[PDB]
Design a protein around this ligand. Structure first.
Ligand code: SF4
Lengths: 112, 269, 232, 464, 482
């Protein structure tokens, strides 16, 4: 569906609270998935952010080592590097590679 | 497939009691597109008046010779001649002795109408029928064929004088009148007869006002086919029915007709 | 004001000659002939009881009208005679206190325009009521008049609309599968389709009053039960 | 909504029926041997689809993906697409080519990247952007049982086998390699498998008169052999490069005028049985290269004026369709009734059910059912007991408004269930069947799996 | 009984028989049993032309000499030479021959235009003469009752009526002219069907005697007098048991249709017997307006709603029908009894919808005590709410009843929703309520019933801004109840 989404996961003693036994407005899409894995370990998972802005289906997502960045490849040969936005909180693509227009071996219009 | 030909409420084409009622008059108006000819309808009318049935369409035509019948029939025309009338209508076997046939074409043009006063011409052409019908007064039917052509013959004649000098006296003297004509003047492509040629169309409109029934034979639309020739329309004329019975009126229907070897067929879409 | 508070009442007063009208004109055509209105006159003007001589002056009609009491054939008279052998049957302009009769003219299209006004001058009296129909589909003869640049005078239609005190227009109500465009077309090339010349018809009424503007309305008239319905 | 037709092209080749006759059939234009030589037969290569195919060097993946993306970007959103193949005789090509072609055409939409066509179709069943069938063009000589099994495995739903005539001299004089009578057995074997079958006709041909043209169509519609579910009428137009232009050059050929052809079309349209869909009397032609014939862009636009002057207007499916939703709902419809017709066609009894307005003759939904015979069935599914097949379900009754108290907020979503249970009633009572089966595209294998039908082979069946 | 068949070869007659209809439906091919020669009872007279049956026990044959045309009769027996009974001596020539409408006697036509009826024991009585020679005819027993739509129950005597059609195709009663050109005719109990030369299927309800010519053909009928049919299609058979008519096309394929009149007769008959399941199926499967269930008899439903609920056990069926309700009389606009009341009148005159601006007077007229919808809703509500078990089976019906009014009591619907022990069941009820009505007003009522969870649960589907429902509850959730 051309969209990329994120999910945060926490171990016990750091799981987000006030979902239970507190008068707060629970939204439809902000449900928290908690699970008691065993007698001593419970994990809480929540949704964080929505990333979009692509031209075709995603094909490859790869992590990094020294940054909170991801590499996104599409079916249009375009390459994007997604980085966090310390100003707006919603991640914005850092670098855009592959502006050459080429579809197949014979190129008429567009790229593929 | 075939359907009956009915033209009145009494389920009869030509009622007999029409001839039995005194102090009455009636007029029929028939128009045919000049790409076709209504002769196959004149024949049916004559047979149904004399023999009492349509003797070519709904009935067989093997004894078609109505000569010396208790009834009578008078036909007069300008388009053709006495020779054509005799030879053809006898080859069509239209009667002779209980019958009258009138030409106004052969030898009539040559200085018998030309270069003579108009009043004498009109008086004599009226007197021809005024004397030819004295014999049998109340068991005849008379049909005139395309009389408007005479308008173009007389030097400078309008519709009014011809109508009041020829048509109305004929219907006043005779019981029933049938007038048949053609309508090419209304069918000139991309030309308007209403510009300056309205004199002839005045005659058509006047006749349709005076008529009681209106019979229309018209050609097919855009193309030409094999199994069908034309369309037949029946309509109520201008004048009302001068009968004496009250339930009488006219049926209202349209036919599709095919003609081939003098044999005609009528049916519905 | 306090008179003729309903249009139907006005129409019935006109029809039955309750209020005198020196001249009334009716327009028709081929799409709907105008001999039903004479039946309307006969039926409505008999409730008040007008058996007074209903003269039927005729120019073209072959048959003798039963609903009328007189019959005159004018295919042999000139203008002066035509005026003269009508003043006898009619209450001519004598006997300043007298009755009124009915006049029915079969056709107006056969009379030359040159005498039109005079035909309404020698006869116009408070004793007579002229009724005549006008066919609009016959274009008159104009070779004799020679309408050149120096021989001019108005046409028949305008004079008829001017010297009239009441005007009624006749039309046939469309019932089946025919509309005005194709109807007028087929009439132009003379095919005369089914759906014409019925008894149920429609009228347009224009009534003129002294020192004022006329009134214009519409009506639906049936020729079977002699009942009316004003335009909605 | 979002019904989509995406045409594809196959690589150029030669139909082998030339081998025993010498050349292509006379009316076939272009071809590899012609001057174009980069184009499949019966196509000059100047069509827009030809342009899009050439730039991709005749590859199905690129053509399909590009056309789908273009259609999506134009402004319509697609979730239901039907593929159609064109050019020559696709079945002649070797084994691996057809398998790879089909796998690519399914993986283009499924998003799958595998092989082993069974797995590809299995994944395509559970995919978005569902596929509603394929339309394969093939010849009588290649419709044997092995090939039919191949097509059933691929996912095809309807064929189109041309005949072009019923006379016997035309087959040899047009260099087409099959006798006319064999097409009847081809129809017989094909129909029992559930394949909707459509044909072709061409009115004017050499040494054919207007009469013979009339009664060939009359015999086609009357004879219980040539009753098929569709038709296409191709008026004969003479392209310079065809074998037809040589006849005109040598003076051995002449055509009809305009009046004769319009009269013929008018007569023909006044005979169509009410269960056949006249596809295109106004077909699509290479315009400027024609040398003989008449204009064909508005033949029916004048034929309609002809039937309005003679009566008995057309009665095909196309003119009577109201559509899925609000095509002619500007006026509230009239009395709705169920009309059921039965006919004998190709050694079997078949039933046509429809929901129609009888006063004005419109169409809302239709269904076809066939009672399997014993002299033509060969499938191991149909050779175990009596059975019946729903050859086609068609529901334009997805209409929201209607006449006679339409469902308020349910809006005919159960309308199709009426017809399904109606079919099951006569399957249980009249046919006396013990199993009922329905054929459908792989993408819609769930709209029928809710009513209880279970999967066996390429079929959706349930017992009684 | 459709188990005996007779076929005539030359000089011999063959009778075949089957045990039962069910056996024929099972696969038992018909069995030929009787073979009877000619010299046994006739001694080689000239002709052997026709044959007919009477109530499964009398077989009639026509034997023709040069001019005499005797009718041989046989009372049937078993396989051992059924005995001869009296053959009569007739002094005329027979043209047509049939049976009677109930398989009791025989009727036949002479070569002059006279139809006569004979009995199975040599009792003869002349019937009628025809105005014109005909090609087909049918004898029917017209009830001599007096009621115009036959609302009597004494079952008065009946009389024999023999119709006829000429070779030209003019339908004739005993002596009554009908439509000018037709091509078919079929008669069953109180029903006549005929197709004109314009090929329109026209119906005649046999009420009583004194027939009159049918009116001129016109466009459309509100009742079921006139229906449009395909060209060339003559009639084949009529099956009123299933309300069907089967006909033959011109190219040689069968067709079957279901005109509205016989389906309406079936549904009325089902109504009369207090059976509210079969009538529902018939009225639904043929797209018949569901209001006719009791709009033709309101009091019966007002007294029998308690069994109407029990007979139809499908919750969805009841929800559909109650949501399928209007206020007009479907007995006057769609299903008039003019299907069989009155004869020789003007035709339907296909109606037109009302102009929009002239319907609002009824809207402003509305009060709860006038509309059928509100009284029906109150009846079903008080019937259902008299037992908690019935509530726990038709809560959907109760919600539909609440929502099927102009003064909708959605507050009561949410009150009923509130008491469930389940959360997803309340969700299903909320979704169903949102189907029929705008989410905006539902949210208004949720606010107006003084609760917090219901308001947000409805607002989930409101498709409004987050800021519409965040601060309002973020303030409301906290303070004191007052
Ligand atoms: S069979 Fe088809 S591809 Fe082959 S020559 Fe004929 S039209 Fe062309």
């Amino acid at each position: 569906d051309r969209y990329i989404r994120l999910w945060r996961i926490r171990i016990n003693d750091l799981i987000d609270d006030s979902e239970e036994d507190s008068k707060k407005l629970t939204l439809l899409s902000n449900k928290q998935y908690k699970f008691q894995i065993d007698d001593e370990l419970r994990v809480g998972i929540n949704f964080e952010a929505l990333i979009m802005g692509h031209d075709d289906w995603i094909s490859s997502l790869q992590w990094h080592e020294s940054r909170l960045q991801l590499l996104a490849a599409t079916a249009d040969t375009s390459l994007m590097v997604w980085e966090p936005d310390e100003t707006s909180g919603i991640w914005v693509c850092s670098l855009r590679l592959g502006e050459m227009s080429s579809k197949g071996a014979s190129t008429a219009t567009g790229s593929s | 497939q075939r359907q009956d030909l009915v033209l009145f409420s009494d389920q009869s084409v030509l009622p007999a009691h029409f001839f039995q009622d005194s102090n009455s008059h009636n007029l029929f108006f028939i128009t045919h597109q000049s790409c076709t000819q209504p002769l196959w309808m004149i024949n049916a009318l004559v047979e149904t008046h004399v023999l009492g049935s349509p003797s070519s369409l709904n009935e067989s035509s093997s004894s078609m010779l109505p000569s010396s019948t208790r009834s009578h029939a008078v036909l007069a025309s300008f388009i053709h001649e006495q020779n054509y009338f005799t030879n053809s209508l006898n080859k069509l076997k239209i009667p002779s002795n209980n019958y009258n046939v009138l030409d106004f074409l052969s030898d009539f043009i040559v200085n018998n109408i030309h270069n003579k006063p108009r009043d004498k011409i009109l008086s004599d052409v009226l007197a021809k029928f005024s004397a030819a019908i004295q014999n049998n007064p109340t068991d005849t039917i008379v049909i005139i064929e395309q009389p408007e052509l005479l308008l173009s013959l007389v030097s400078g004649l309008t519709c009014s004088e011809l109508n009041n000098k020829f048509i109305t006296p004929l219907l006043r003297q005779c019981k029933v009148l049938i007038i048949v004509s053609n309508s090419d003047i209304f069918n000139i492509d991309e030309y308007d007869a209403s510009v300056h040629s309205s004199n002839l169309q005045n005659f058509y409109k006047s006749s349709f006002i005076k008529s009681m029934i209106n019979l229309n034979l018209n050609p097919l639309k855009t193309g030409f086919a094999k199994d069908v020739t034309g369309s037949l329309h029946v309509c109520r004329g201008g004048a009302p029915i001068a009968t004496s019975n009250t339930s009488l009126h006219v049926v209202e229907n349209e036919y599709l007709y095919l003609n081939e070897k003098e044999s005609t067929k009528l049916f519905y879409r | 004001a306090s008179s003729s508070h309903n249009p139907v009442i006005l129409l019935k007063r006109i029809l039955s000659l309750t209020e005198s009208s020196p001249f009334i004109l009716c327009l028709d055509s081929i799409a709907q002939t105008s001999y039903k209105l004479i039946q309307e006159f006969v039926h409505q003007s008999k409730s008040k009881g007008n058996e007074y001589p209903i003269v039927y002056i005729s120019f073209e009609t072959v048959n003798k009208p039963s609903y009328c009491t007189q019959f005159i054939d004018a295919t042999q008279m000139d203008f002066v005679h035509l005026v003269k052998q009508i003043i006898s049957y009619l209450p001519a302009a004598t006997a300043t206190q007298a009755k009124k009769h009915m006049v029915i003219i079969d056709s107006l299209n056969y009379i030359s325009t040159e005498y039109i006004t005079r035909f309404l001058s020698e006869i116009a009296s408070p004793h007579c009521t002229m009724v005549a129909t006008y066919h609009k589909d016959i274009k008159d003869e104009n070779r004799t008049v020679i309408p050149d640049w120096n021989n001019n005078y108005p046409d028949k239609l305008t004079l008829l609309q001017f010297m009239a005190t009441t005007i009624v227009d006749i039309d046939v109500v469309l019932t089946g599968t025919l509309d005005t465009e194709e109807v007028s077309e087929l009439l132009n090339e003379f095919r005369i389709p089914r759906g014409l010349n019925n008894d149920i018809f429609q009228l347009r009424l224009v009534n003129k009053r002294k020192s004022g503007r006329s009134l214009e309305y519409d009506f639906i008239v049936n020729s079977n039960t002699h009942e009316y319905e004003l335009l909605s | 909504s979002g019904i989509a037709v995406v045409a594809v092209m196959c690589k150029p080749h030669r139909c082998p029926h030339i081998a025993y006759t010498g050349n292509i059939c006379v009316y076939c234009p272009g071809g590899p041997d012609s001057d174009f030589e980069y184009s499949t037969q019966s196509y000059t290569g100047y069509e827009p689809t030809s342009m899009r195919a050439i730039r991709a060097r005749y590859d199905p993946y690129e053509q399909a993906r590009g056309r789908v993306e273009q259609l999506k970007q134009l402004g319509h959103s697609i979730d239901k697409v039907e593929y159609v193949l064109m050019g020559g005789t696709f079945m002649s090509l070797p084994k691996e080519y057809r398998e790879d072609f089909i796998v690519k055409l399914h993986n283009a939409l499924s998003g799958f990247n595998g092989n082993d066509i069974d797995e590809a179709i299995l994944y395509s069943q559970q995919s978005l952007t569902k596929c509603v069938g394929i339309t394969i063009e093939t010849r009588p000589d290649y419709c044997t049982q092995t090939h039919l099994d191949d097509m059933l495995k691929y996912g095809c739903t309807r064929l189109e086998i041309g005949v072009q005539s019923l006379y016997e001299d035309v087959a040899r004089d047009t260099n087409r390699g099959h006798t006319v009578r064999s097409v009847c057995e081809t129809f017989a074997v094909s129909k029992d498998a559930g394949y909707k079958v459509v044909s072709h006709m061409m009115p004017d041909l050499p040494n054919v008169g207007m009469e013979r043209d009339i009664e060939q169509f009359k015999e086609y519609f009357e004879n219980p052999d040539f009753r098929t579910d569709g038709l296409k009428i191709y008026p004969t137009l003479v392209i310079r490069g065809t074998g037809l232009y040589e006849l005109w050059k040598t003076g051995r050929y002449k055509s009809y005028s305009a009046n004769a052809l319009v009269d013929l079309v008018a007569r023909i349209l006044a005979l169509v049985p009410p269960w056949t869909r006249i596809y295109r009397v106004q077909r699509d032609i290479p315009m400027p290269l024609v040398t003989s014939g008449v204009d064909n862009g508005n033949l029916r636009e004048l034929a309609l004026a002809r039937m309005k002057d003679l009566g008995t207007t057309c009665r095909d499916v196309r003119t009577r369709e109201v559509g899925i939703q609000e095509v002619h709902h500007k006026v509230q419809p009239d009395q709705v009734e169920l009309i059921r017709r039965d006919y004998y066609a190709n050694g079997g009894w078949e039933t046509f059910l429809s929901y129609e307005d009888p006063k004005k003759d419109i169409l809302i939904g239709l269904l076809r059912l066939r009672k399997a015979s014993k002299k033509y069935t060969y499938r191991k599914e149909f050779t175990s007991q009596r059975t019946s097949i729903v050859r086609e379900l068609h529901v334009y009754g997805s209409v929201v408004p209607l006449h006679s108290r339409d469902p308020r907020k349910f809006q005919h979503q159960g309308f199709g269930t009426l017809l399904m249970e109606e079919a099951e009633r006569i399957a249980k009572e009249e046919h006396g069947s013990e199993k009922i089966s329905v054929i459908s595209g792989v993408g819609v294998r769930n709209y029928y799996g809710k009513l209880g039908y279970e999967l066996d082979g390429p079929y959706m069946s349930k017992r009684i | 009984s459709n188990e005996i068949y007779a076929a005539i070869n030359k000089d011999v007659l063959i009778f075949a028989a089957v045990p039962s209809i069910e056996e024929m439906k099972k696969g038992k091919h018909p069995s030929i049993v009787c073979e009877f020669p000619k010299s046994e009872f006739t001694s080689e007279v000239d002709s052997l032309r026709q044959v007919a049956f009477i109530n499964d026990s009398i077989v009639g044959v026509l034997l023709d000499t040069d001019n005499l045309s005797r009718i041989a009769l046989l009372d049937i027996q078993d396989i051992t030479q059924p005995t001869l009974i009296t053959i009569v001596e007739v002094y005329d020539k027979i043209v047509l021959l049939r049976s009677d409408f109930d398989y009791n006697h025989l009727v036949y036509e002479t070569r002059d235009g006279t139809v006569c009826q004979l009995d199975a024991e040599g009792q003869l009585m002349e019937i009628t003469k025809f105005p014109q020679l005909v090609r087909d005819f049918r004898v029917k027993r017209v009830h001599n009752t007096s009621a115009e739509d036959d609302d009597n129950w004494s079952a008065e005597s009946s009389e024999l009526v023999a119709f006829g059609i000429t070779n030209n195709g003019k339908l004739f009663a005993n002596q009554v002219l009908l439509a000018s050109a037709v091509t078919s005719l079929e008669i069953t109990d109180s029903f006549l069907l005929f197709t004109t030369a314009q090929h329109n299927l026209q119906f005649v309800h046999l009420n009583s005697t004194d027939f009159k010519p049918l009116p001129l053909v016109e466009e459309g009928v509100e009742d079921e007098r006139v229906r449009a049919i395909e060209r060339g299609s003559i009639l084949v058979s009529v099956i009123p048991s299933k309300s069907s008519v089967v006909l033959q096309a011109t190219r040689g394929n069968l067709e079957t249709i279901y005109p509205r009149i016989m389906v309406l007769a079936e549904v009325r008959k089902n109504i009369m017997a207090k059976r509210y399941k079969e009538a529902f199926i018939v009225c639904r499967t043929h797209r018949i307006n569901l209001d006719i269930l009791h709009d033709y008899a309101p009091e019966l439903f007002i007294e029998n709603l308690e069994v109407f609920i029990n007979q139809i056990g499908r919750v969805d069926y009841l929800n559909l029908f109650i949501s399928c309700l209007s206020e007009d009389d479907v007995t006057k606009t769609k299903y008039k009894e003019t299907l069989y009341s009155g004869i020789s009148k003007s035709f339907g005159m296909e109606p037109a919808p009302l102009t929009e601006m002239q319907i609002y007077m009824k809207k402003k007229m509305f009060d709860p005590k006038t509309s059928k919808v509100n009284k029906i809703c109150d009846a079903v509500l008080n019937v259902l709410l008299s037992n908690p078990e019935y509530k726990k089976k038709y809560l959907q019906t109760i919600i539909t009843a609440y929502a099927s009014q102009n003064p909708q009591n959605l507050s009561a619907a949410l009150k009923l929703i509130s008491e469930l022990e389940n959360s997803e069941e309340k969700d299903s009820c909320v979704t169903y309520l949102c189907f029929l009505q705008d989410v905006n007003v539902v949210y208004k009522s949720a606010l107006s019933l003084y609760d917090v969870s219901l308001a947000l649960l409805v607002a989930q589907k409101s498709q409004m801004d987050p800021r519409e429902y965040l601060p309002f509850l973020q303030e409301l959730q906290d303070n004191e109840p007052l």
